Structure formats: C-alpha cells, structure tokens
Amino acid sequence: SGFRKMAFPSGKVEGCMVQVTCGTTTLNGLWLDDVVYCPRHVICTSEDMLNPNYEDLLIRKSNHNFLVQAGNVQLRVIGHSMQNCVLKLKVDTANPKTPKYKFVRIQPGQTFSVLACYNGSPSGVYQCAMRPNFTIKGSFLNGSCGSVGFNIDYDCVSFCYMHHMELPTGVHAGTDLEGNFYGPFVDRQTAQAAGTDTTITVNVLAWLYAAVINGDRWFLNRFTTTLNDFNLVAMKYNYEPLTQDHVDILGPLSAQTGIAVLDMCASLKELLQNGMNGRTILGSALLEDEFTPFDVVRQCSGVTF
Amino acid sequence: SGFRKMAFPSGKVEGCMVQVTCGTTTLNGLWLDDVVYCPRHVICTSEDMLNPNYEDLLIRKSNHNFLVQAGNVQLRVIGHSMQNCVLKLKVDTANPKTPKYKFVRIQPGQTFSVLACYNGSPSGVYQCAMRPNFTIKGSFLNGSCGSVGFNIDYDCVSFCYMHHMELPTGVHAGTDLEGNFYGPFVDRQTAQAAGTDTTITVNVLAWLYAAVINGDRWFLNRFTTTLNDFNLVAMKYNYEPLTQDHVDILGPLSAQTGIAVLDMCASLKELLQNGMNGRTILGSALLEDEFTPFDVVRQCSGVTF
Numbered sequence: 001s002g003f004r005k006m007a008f009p010s011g012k013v014e015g016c017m018v019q020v021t022c023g024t025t026t027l028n029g030l031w032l033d034d035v036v037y038c039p040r041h042v043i044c045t046s047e048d049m050l051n052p053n054y055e056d057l058l059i060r061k062s063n064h065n066f067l068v069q070a071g072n073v074q075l076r077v078i079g080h081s082m083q084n085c086v087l088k089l090k091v092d093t094a095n096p097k098t099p100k101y102k103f104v105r106i107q108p109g110q111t112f113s114v115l116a117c118y119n120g121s122p123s124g125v126y127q128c129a130m131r132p133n134f135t136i137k138g139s140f141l142n143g144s145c146g147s148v149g150f151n152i153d154y155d156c157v158s159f160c161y162m163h164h165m166e167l168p169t170g171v172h173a174g175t176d177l178e179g180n181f182y183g184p185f186v187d188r189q190t191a192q193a194a195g196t197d198t199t200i201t202v203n204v205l206a207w208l209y210a211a212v213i214n215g216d217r218w219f220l221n222r223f224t225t226t227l228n229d230f231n232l233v234a235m236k237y238n239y240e241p242l243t244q245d246h247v248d249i250l251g252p253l254s255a256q257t258g259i260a261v262l263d264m265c266a267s268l269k270e271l272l273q274n275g276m277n278g279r280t281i282l283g284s285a286l287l288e289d290e291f292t293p294f295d296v297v298r299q300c301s302g303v304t305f
Numbered sequence: 306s307g308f309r310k311m312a313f314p315s316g317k318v319e320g321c322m323v324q325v326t327c328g329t330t331t332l333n334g335l336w337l338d339d340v341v342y343c344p345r346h347v348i349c350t351s352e353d354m355l356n357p358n359y360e361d362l363l364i365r366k367s368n369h370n371f372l373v374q375a376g377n378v379q380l381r382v383i384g385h386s387m388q389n390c391v392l393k394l395k396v397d398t399a400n401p402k403t404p405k406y407k408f409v410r411i412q413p414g415q416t417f418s419v420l421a422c423y424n425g426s427p428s429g430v431y432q433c434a435m436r437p438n439f440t441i442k443g444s445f446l447n448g449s450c451g452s453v454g455f456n457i458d459y460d461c462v463s464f465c466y467m468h469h470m471e472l473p474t475g476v477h478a479g480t481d482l483e484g485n486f487y488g489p490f491v492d493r494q495t496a497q498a499a500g501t502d503t504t505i506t507v508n509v510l511a512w513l514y515a516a517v518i519n520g521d522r523w524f525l526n527r528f529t530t531t532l533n534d535f536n537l538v539a540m541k542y543n544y545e546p547l548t549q550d551h552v553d554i555l556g557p558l559s560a561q562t563g564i565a566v567l568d569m570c571a572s573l574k575e576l577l578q579n580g581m582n583g584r585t586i587l588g589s590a591l592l593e594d595e596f597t598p599f600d601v602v603r604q605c606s607g608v609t610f
Contacts, residue, residue, distance in 0.1 A: 001446075001475040004442075005431060006421065008429060009316075009420065009427035009428075010315050010316055011316030012316075014314050014316040116311065116607075118607045118609045122314035123314075123603075123607055124311035124312060125311065125314055125430055126311045128309070138307050139307040139309035139604060141606075144607065170306040170307060170519065171307075214475065215475055275583070278580070280591065299444060302421075302428055302447075305428065
C-alpha cells in the first residue's frame, strides 16, 4: 500500500544522454543509434535568442562545430540536419546502450518522467504532466535544455518531450522528438504567455480511486451526478470537461473499487464546492492531477520494466 | 526555475537488482560484488511471520534453496549468512555492474530515493524521508520487499534502506544494509504502532527557501522570532524542535536569499498559526518536509552524477 508520485526507472535513458557544445553554448543531447538529437537553439548566443533566423545561423555551422561528448569520450559528427526545432547530429558510432525506443507525441493530460541533466550528466528524475495549456511544470536550470521526457512499456522507451524554453512565469515549453513544440510556443526569447492551466479532471478522479484503494476514504459521500451536471461545476472551477471517453478509461478503477465513476464525480463535486476543510488525501491538501488512470492501475498493480 | 520532488537517477541501482526466491516466497535482492543482500523473511511462509524463529528456520535452508536470478540468468549461491535482519547470499560471480558504494545508516529527517522493484525488476523511483518515528511513507505492494533506498554523491551510491514491512496503518519499516531496523520495528506480523509523525522543521524551512528562490514569496512577512519562541509554536503543531545545528545547516540558503533563518522561522510560525488561506507554495497546499537543506541546494544548483 501507499501511493507516491513515481517516475519510471531512468537507467535506459541515462545511457542515451550526451553533452552537445556549439561555440559557447552547452546543453544535452539524446544519443539513439547513430543520431544525437538536441534543441536547435544550441547554435544561438543569448543575443541570437531575441530574434533568431535558424536556417541563417545554421549556414555558419559545420559538423566539426558540434562538440558531442559521451561521458569522457568524444563522438565524431559526420552530418547534421534541422528537423523543426531539433538538430539531428549524425555520429560515426551507434550508441551501444540504445534501448528499444519510439518517438510519440503525447496529449495534454498525459504524464511522463523527466531525466533532468546538465553537461550530459543526469541530475535527477521526476514525474510531470503535459498541462492543458501545453506547458509543463518542471525543474530546469540553465544547461538543462535537451533533457527528455519519456514513458517505458516493459523494455521500450517512448520519448515524448525534449526541454527547450522557460517562459517568464517560470513554466516550461518544449518539443516532441520530431522537434515540434507542444502548444503555440516558439524557441525565441519573446512575449509568450501561457493560457489557463486547467485541472486534468480524469486524472483527479483516477487519484481519488487510488486514495480509496489505499484506504483514504473520508471524501466518499452519499451523492451521484451526471456528466452534464458535473461539467457545470468543472467549468466553474477551471477543470477540463469530463467526456464519456474519460468515463470509459476509468472503468477498470470503478470495477476494482465498486464505486461508479459518476459517484466519484459527485465526491469530486463536493470537494470542489466545500474544499478539504484542512484534511488531506494521500498526503495532499489539494486535488492531484498528475496521475493518469493508467498510472494508478500500473502503480496499484506493480508493473515492472 | 521550478522545484520538483526529484529522485536520484536510478540506473546504478537498477544494475544491482535481482530476484531471490526461497520456497514459495519471491522478493528482491541487492547484488554488490559477490554478495546478494535481501530481507531474512524470504525464508518465512505468511504463517511463519506471526512468530518466526529465524535461526531455527534458517537451519532448514541450504545454499541451493536460495534461487537468485539476475535478469534471465541464474546466479550460483556458494554461501549464506544472517546479519541482523538481512541475509547475505555469497554468489560465485561479482556483479559486473557494481557501482562505487557505501552502506550508511541515515538519521530521521534525511531523504533518499527508493527504486520500487517486483521479481528483481525495477517498477519506479520516488523520493521520500526517514520520518521522525522511523517509518517511511512509501509505495510498496506484495513482492516489493528488498527494494532499496539510496543517495548518490557523483559516482558513489550510499545505500541507506531496504524495505521489509508494512504496518497495519499502511506506513513502511525496514533496515539499513547491515540489517538493523530503523526505529523499534521487527520483522514479525505483530502489533507494531508508529509514534507521532512529527514534521521535519529544518526541511520545511529549506523548502520555504526553495520557494523564495523560485519566486513563491507571498508568505514572507515583517516578523522575526527566536529559537525558543519558534519552538513553543513547533511543539504545539507537532514540529521537530529547531536547534542551532539546523540554523547553521540553513546558513547557505539564508546567504543566497538574504533572508535570516529566524525571519524565515517567523514566516513559518505565521503559516502554522494562520494556515495557507487557500494559497499554495511550490504547488503544495501543505508545508512540505521531504526536502533537506542539501536537496534544496543540490536541485537549485544543478549538481550531476
């Protein structure tokens, strides 16, 4: 028993992290087979970031200008190309630690693990969610760019995020491994404000199921609701609308606990309207939304990799 | 910027996890050099756990009764011994992935990463603290015993915890890697109640410094206090007494922010007396105590391994 914010084991990803230096800029790259992926802004000075023309800046770069180091050992760059907002540095050596992997583009509400790195060296691992406004709330210092987000299914690493940008409000923006930003964000030091950070309702419900499974029960009430009634309350409290698809996804947790999804929605409705009254659920004083239904099933069942 | 509950990268520990089976009991072992460490209760049936005599149960076990599997590959057991509440299974093969390591016994308030494992396979990593009552609040299902807690200093893994027991209240007890339980707990299925789970004051203060560094500032006030005045409030709210040693440990964070430790104590005093008033600090609605001053410096400075 017990329920923790839990990251995937990071070893398979640690074996892929390298340092990429272009001129005075050092950040992280992801070495898979004979390609190193990194943010294209490695080619920019702080000055360049105000209004960069990446194709023009890239003309002044040769293979030998991209310094790629895997631990103490230099990798030879035999080609480079830009794909959207990432560079692909072709190296003459396949990463011998390349795991089974996929590139996936995740939906808002999906969770993933981040391996925060500096100078190609892993510093820590934490679990976070693609927010509905396509930001993430990470922990990223200067030099963390090129750190990646991922999920693991048994032995296959699904890479879903590469870190590029901190907004002036201290939230984070980045790309998939095809170099396409999540949301409207761009790799330029400019006015970019995030939209409403709404709460991921289906994840809050999953976490309330996790609470019941782990013996936190006080918030269960005598009420039910409908999707339409619940969504009137969701809208007021800046929660994502709950759809029949979300209800279907929560089916297994409903089955496990015998608590109908709409009954749990009624519990959530009362928590939104009445607050916590100084009580906690799984050690939180707020409704946690960075566990997916799949995360709750996985953690509550002990799935391994 | 941003501040996350962050675990150490788990790769060095993943390379040490094995499955240990004795009769019908399977759990995890830690393979370092030519020794596998596991909970001695691997030799017990569920029935045995009510009142086990471990020396007597162990007489009926031979080397060949301890099935040790590293991935798909069986390890040959050439000796076994009991040290306190752990077994040391001597194997004929040194773990080729053995990292630099130490065994440390941590103090209450210290944090560490747990690599939750099942059948010798890592499931996830999370960060937790030795509670003042010598429990931990983990995420442990049946089969997770032998999962370990650790810290990393650059390339050296300090192993501090091995998981043994869940108390009837769903909190967790275990040993150091010398097999000595933290606190008064025993490896028997018996009446064991935890003492007061007090709040780790020095860690709450460290986290309030982390909040200021990351721009969460609303709780700073015009007040100061003394250790003795603060401790009158700490005692009322089941916080650990703050000592001059804690004040000294917070010195670097005080220096970094220009906020005197006793001024931050006055901010904490007001938060305890007035509550949060529906506000959050670093995305929490409660005062977080599972970051040490060293964790806050490490995360805020980007230290790597």
